Each structure stands twice: as structure tokens, then as C-alpha cells.
Enzyme design. Sequence first.
Site, PDB file in Angstrom:
ATOM      1  N   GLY A  27       0.822  -1.226   0.000  1.00  0.00           N
ATOM      2  CA  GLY A  27       0.000   0.000   0.000  1.00  0.00           C
ATOM      3  C   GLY A  27       0.845   1.260   0.000  1.00  0.00           C
ATOM      4  N   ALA A  30       4.845   3.051  -3.895  1.00  0.00           N
ATOM      5  CA  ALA A  30       6.185   3.415  -4.412  1.00  0.00           C
ATOM      6  C   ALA A  30       6.457   2.755  -5.768  1.00  0.00           C
ATOM      7  CB  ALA A  30       7.242   3.060  -3.397  1.00  0.00           C
ATOM      8  N   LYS A  49       8.553  -8.558  -7.184  1.00  0.00           N
ATOM      9  CA  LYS A  49       8.681  -7.266  -7.849  1.00  0.00           C
ATOM     10  C   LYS A  49       8.743  -7.481  -9.353  1.00  0.00           C
ATOM     11  CE  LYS A  49      12.086  -4.369  -6.794  1.00  0.00           C
ATOM     12  NZ  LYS A  49      11.820  -2.922  -6.577  1.00  0.00           N
ATOM     13  N   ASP A 145      23.081   5.627  -2.280  1.00  0.00           N
ATOM     14  CA  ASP A 145      21.640   5.836  -2.311  1.00  0.00           C
ATOM     15  C   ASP A 145      20.971   5.291  -1.054  1.00  0.00           C
ATOM     16  OD1 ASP A 145      19.183   6.597  -3.245  1.00  0.00           O
ATOM     17  OD2 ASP A 145      19.006   4.970  -4.716  1.00  0.00           O
TER      18      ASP A 145
HETATM   19  C1  LIG Z   1       8.703   6.658   6.572  1.00  0.00           C
HETATM   20  C2  LIG Z   1       7.960   6.094   5.349  1.00  0.00           C
HETATM   21  C3  LIG Z   1       7.092   4.916   5.686  1.00  0.00           C
HETATM   22  O1  LIG Z   1       7.201   3.915   5.001  1.00  0.00           O
HETATM   23  N1  LIG Z   1       6.251   5.053   6.717  1.00  0.00           N
HETATM   24  C4  LIG Z   1       5.010   4.358   7.054  1.00  0.00           C
HETATM   25  C5  LIG Z   1       4.301   3.622   5.938  1.00  0.00           C
HETATM   26  C6  LIG Z   1       3.219   4.233   5.310  1.00  0.00           C
HETATM   27  C7  LIG Z   1       2.555   3.577   4.279  1.00  0.00           C
HETATM   28  C8  LIG Z   1       2.958   2.321   3.859  1.00  0.00           C
HETATM   29  C9  LIG Z   1       4.038   1.719   4.486  1.00  0.00           C
HETATM   30  C10 LIG Z   1       4.417   0.364   3.987  1.00  0.00           C
HETATM   31  O2  LIG Z   1       3.806  -0.066   3.023  1.00  0.00           O
HETATM   32  N2  LIG Z   1       5.393  -0.308   4.588  1.00  0.00           N
HETATM   33  C11 LIG Z   1       5.790  -1.542   4.209  1.00  0.00           C
HETATM   34  C12 LIG Z   1       4.887  -2.533   3.892  1.00  0.00           C
HETATM   35  C13 LIG Z   1       5.346  -3.771   3.475  1.00  0.00           C
HETATM   36  C14 LIG Z   1       6.687  -4.067   3.352  1.00  0.00           C
HETATM   37  N3  LIG Z   1       6.986  -5.326   2.959  1.00  0.00           N
HETATM   38  C15 LIG Z   1       8.027  -5.688   2.189  1.00  0.00           C
HETATM   39  N4  LIG Z   1       8.758  -6.712   2.690  1.00  0.00           N
HETATM   40  C16 LIG Z   1       9.839  -7.140   2.046  1.00  0.00           C
HETATM   41  C17 LIG Z   1      10.257  -6.522   0.876  1.00  0.00           C
HETATM   42  C18 LIG Z   1       9.519  -5.444   0.410  1.00  0.00           C
HETATM   43  C19 LIG Z   1       9.968  -4.796  -0.848  1.00  0.00           C
HETATM   44  C20 LIG Z   1      11.246  -5.047  -1.315  1.00  0.00           C
HETATM   45  C21 LIG Z   1      11.678  -4.420  -2.482  1.00  0.00           C
HETATM   46  C22 LIG Z   1      10.836  -3.548  -3.166  1.00  0.00           C
HETATM   47  N5  LIG Z   1       9.606  -3.322  -2.678  1.00  0.00           N
HETATM   48  C23 LIG Z   1       9.166  -3.906  -1.544  1.00  0.00           C
HETATM   49  N6  LIG Z   1       8.407  -5.033   1.068  1.00  0.00           N
HETATM   50  C24 LIG Z   1       7.589  -3.040   3.648  1.00  0.00           C
HETATM   51  C25 LIG Z   1       9.071  -3.140   3.569  1.00  0.00           C
HETATM   52  C26 LIG Z   1       7.140  -1.802   4.056  1.00  0.00           C
HETATM   53  C27 LIG Z   1       4.722   2.362   5.518  1.00  0.00           C
HETATM   54  C28 LIG Z   1       7.172   7.082   4.547  1.00  0.00           C
HETATM   55  O3  LIG Z   1       6.431   6.674   3.671  1.00  0.00           O
HETATM   56  C29 LIG Z   1       7.321   8.563   4.700  1.00  0.00           C
HETATM   57  C30 LIG Z   1       7.603   8.897   6.144  1.00  0.00           C
HETATM   58  C31 LIG Z   1       8.810   8.187   6.715  1.00  0.00           C
HETATM   59  C32 LIG Z   1      10.034   8.769   6.017  1.00  0.00           C
HETATM   60  C33 LIG Z   1       8.852   8.573   8.168  1.00  0.00           C
HETATM   61  O4  LIG Z   1       7.887   9.114   8.684  1.00  0.00           O
HETATM   62  O5  LIG Z   1       9.999   8.251   9.006  1.00  0.00           O
HETATM   63  C34 LIG Z   1      10.096   8.788  10.321  1.00  0.00           C
END
Ligand SMILES: *[C@@H]1[C@@H](C(=O)NCc2cccc(C(=O)Nc3ccc(Nc4nccc(-c5cccnc5)n4)c(C)c3)c2)C(=O)CC[C@@]1(C)C(=O)OC
Length: 353
Positions: A27, A30, A49, A145
Amino acid sequence: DNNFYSVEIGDSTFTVLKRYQNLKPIGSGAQGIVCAAYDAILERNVAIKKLSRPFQNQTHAKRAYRELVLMKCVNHKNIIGLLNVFTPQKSLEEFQDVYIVMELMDANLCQVIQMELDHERMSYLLYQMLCGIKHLHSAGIIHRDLKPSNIVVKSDCTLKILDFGLARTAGTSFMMYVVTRYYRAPEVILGMGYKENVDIWSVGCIMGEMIKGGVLFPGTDHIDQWNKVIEQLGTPCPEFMKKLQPTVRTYVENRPKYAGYSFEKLFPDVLFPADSEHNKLKASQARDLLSKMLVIDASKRISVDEALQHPYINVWYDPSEAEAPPPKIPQLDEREHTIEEWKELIYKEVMDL
Ligand SMILES: *[C@@H]1[C@@H](C(=O)NCc2cccc(C(=O)Nc3ccc(Nc4nccc(-c5cccnc5)n4)c(C)c3)c2)C(=O)CC[C@@]1(C)C(=O)OC
């Protein structure tokens, strides 16, 4: 018969092997379409991905080829690993998309920073990052990065790195890619060149972000970034100014001079866990390591090797995540090739599966 299956997710047509089912997208919204699914064969949940069109232009294929080949041949606790790679199209003619599965992680490093943590957790998270980058630097790869959105951790605070960055190829700060300027070094922003200590700056800014709960250097534009760095850290000494390029050397000196703030008032004991001598001493050590890593001048920047031997970080020292065998990537090339060659080049690895 059919070995792939289809579903339209996140405004995009998604098609992968049937082993993974009940697709759930991230959700976050990105760039890079990824969804969470469960793999039946080895009984583990997976992140998948998709490459939309790896060959839209030369910039895409170069980064896509880079990340596939190097992720296939580096194997480390603090770097994310590749499990399987595949594409539904069976011949290069219509071969146009590529999918990547890997081990699933619970969350980003960004959200972990929101929840209060403790010195034991913070340091182990950094320890892992430094040996993640140290394993990369020994391979000859400069990330440049590093950011919280490229970093994932699990429920046991096991940290893994998602991206391989640019691998020390491009030096431009704003490309046709990264939505973050905040964690980038002073040298890169001034186009002064980079060495292996560039990444030390970004782990310093990430470390500082945990303590405060907000972005250490929030810059609205390319040049606000530099102003924010010197507003808190102070204006650099003249020896640093000599190596800067004259066009923007002029600008730095003409820009106002700020004395800067010390790390005690930058990072007060209130934001740290306190009231204990262990807490106070751990607050000291954290600030002392931040000073050594948050240096404008690259030459006094602490090395990753010295950073690992810092008292705040050396408590987790064991050679197998740190002193790992260097990964060897002999298909390696510094050159750029034809678009048709790019598809043919990546087709080899995905079809030699
Ligand atoms: C922090 C930042 C932030 O992410 N904050 C909260 C947030 C808001 C909305 C969505 C999410 C979220 O989706 N997090 C999330 C969900 C699932 C996963 N799973 C996952 N696991 C393994 C691999 C991957 C992956 C690998 C490669 C490519 N794509 C995915 N995904 C993950 C990792 C994360 C989180 C912000 O959005 C802005 C604000 C920030 C900077 C902040 O407030 O920091 C203090």
C-alpha cells in the site's frame, strides 16, 4: 499446459507462477510493483517485484541488469537475497516483462524509526547496516543511495538492504529514481567526488533520525539541503573549500557563515533513553559516533571498519556477518550496449534458469 497465471492488480496486469497465490500488493504506492504472496513449495511468504518494461530506455536496462546479476551472486545476512527469477514469455520476441521474488520482510526501516526503540535495538540495526555496506565496499560497490525506504527489517530486528544503488557509476544527484535528497553526502551534493566514506554520511543521518523522530536535514530543494547541513553543523573550514569547484565554491563562501550546533544540543539526552548511567554513557557513545560520522570533510570521516570497532557497535561483533568472503562477479562490464543486446543479455540469465 499453463505454468503462469494472471491477475490485474494495482492498475497493472500482473502474471506470475501459480505457486504464489492470494496476491496482496504493498500500500506504499512506491515505484516498482511488488506484492506479498505465499509460496507453496518451500512453505514461505515471498515479495515479488515486476519489471514493467526493462527496456524503455538505456537507463532502465542498465540498472535492471545490474541488480539481477549482483543480487544472484552476493549472499549475506544484511543484504536481501534472490530466490527465483522468471518471466512468462518463453521467446525473446515478446519477451517484455520480468518478475523477481525474494524473501519477505515485515516492514521498512522508516516505520521502525517511528516506534520508540532502545540502544540495544538501534545499534544492532546500525551494526547490520555497516557490515551490509562493508560487504558491498569490499566487493567494490559504493551504494550512495542509502535511505530508510531502501532498508527492510524483520520482527527480530534483522536488517537487509533492498537496493544496490548505482554501484559507483553515476555521480549526478538528480536523475530521471530517488525521491530523497536528505541522506546524501556534502561531497555528492557539491559534485566534489566520492570515496568509500560517502555512505558513512547517510548512515549517520539515518542514525540521527531514530533519536529525534524526524528527518535530520529536511531540504525542500537541491540547495536547501546544503543550507540545512551548515545551519546545524556549521560552516566548513577553508581547507575543505579549496577542492570545491570554483563555480559553486564562490557560492558557499558568499552564503552566510553559521557557527553550527554541537551534538549535545543537536542530540540532547531527553531524546535518548536516560536517567541511568548506562543510558547516559550510551547516550554519550551514540553522540560521539555521530560526530565522527557526520563530518562535512570526507577526509576526517570515520571509516566503516573503524565504525564497526566503535564501542557502541563492537558489542555485536562476529566475523561471519562482517568478515565475510568477498563476492566475485566474473559477464561483468563497465560498458553500455544496444537496447536489443540488453534484452538478449538479460534473457540469458532468466532463461538459463
Ligand atoms: C517513513 C515512510 C514509511 O514507510 N512510513 C510508514 C508507511 C506508510 C505507508 C505504507 C508503508 C508500507 O507499506 N510499509 C511496508 C509494507 C510492506 C513491506 N513489505 C516488504 N517486505 C519485504 C520486501 C519489500 C519490498 C522489497 C523491495 C521492493 N519493494 C518492496 N516489502 C515493507 C518493507 C514496508 C509504511 C514514509 O512513507 C514517509 C515517512 C517516513 C520517512 C517517516 O515518517 O519516518 C520517520
